[PDB]
Design a protein around this ligand. Sequence first.
Ligand SMILES: NS(=O)(=O)c1cccc(-c2[nH]nc3ccc(NC(=O)Cc4ccccc4)cc23)c1
Length: 254
Amino acid sequence: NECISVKGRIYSILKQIGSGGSSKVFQVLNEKKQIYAIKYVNLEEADNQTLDSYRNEIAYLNKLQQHSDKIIRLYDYEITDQYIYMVMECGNIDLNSWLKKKKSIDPWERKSYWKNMLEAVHTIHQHGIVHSDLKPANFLIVDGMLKLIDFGIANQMGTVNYMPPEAIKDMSPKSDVWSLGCILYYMTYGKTPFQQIINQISKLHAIIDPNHEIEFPDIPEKDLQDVLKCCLKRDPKQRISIPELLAHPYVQIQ
Ligand SMILES: NS(=O)(=O)c1cccc(-c2[nH]nc3ccc(NC(=O)Cc4ccccc4)cc23)c1
């Protein structure tokens, strides 16, 4: 429960939120006992390829401020040769942990969270960023809304269930549509489209191979069932885009 100093301001560690691959996230308090979330990154083992990934992520996160409130608020940051300190907004819970704990999600709650997800991905697309690795863990519940925490530029610490078929064949902004579709599918049927296929090798084949029909059981919300069919199209040309999804009846009609 040590102390942290960022750009002259002192912060006391309250509790550690999480840890993963030379990185750590802590609950901190300023002199006025106001809460913040500080991300600490250890750079002693990272090479120039990994270093440029963190630098690019920090730059885009700082630029995305005031552009949208669907991106985590970054108040200040400190970068040295040894470490990175990022003073951010403190949230309630990540979407991945919240989805696993929830028994059944409300239809209005599913719609409101989908809208937030579309608007955050649209904002990063407008600034030329393509996430390519979207999963619920990249989203945080804060101030009664969902906010994107990372843009997938830097290597961080589920599995291959949200991977688009284009990325598997590559050995496009439409890639983020498939990943978002898998999150909404989980919010609709309680499972991912390829969660039943336990074998990782057999799972990767099922995503890319055509004729392997993805089940879409009938639900009262006919517009919601349509979004999933449009989002989970193996062909990126036939797949719906983010600006088209923002005008879909599911997000615009009551
Ligand atoms: N209610 S709470 O205080 O307990 C809580 C719970 C969950 C999230 C937050 C939480 N608040 N603000 C956050 C900013 C970033 C972040 N995550 C990462 O940047 C990725 C990461 C994760 C682990 C290790 C290394 C990197 C989480 C944030 C707060």
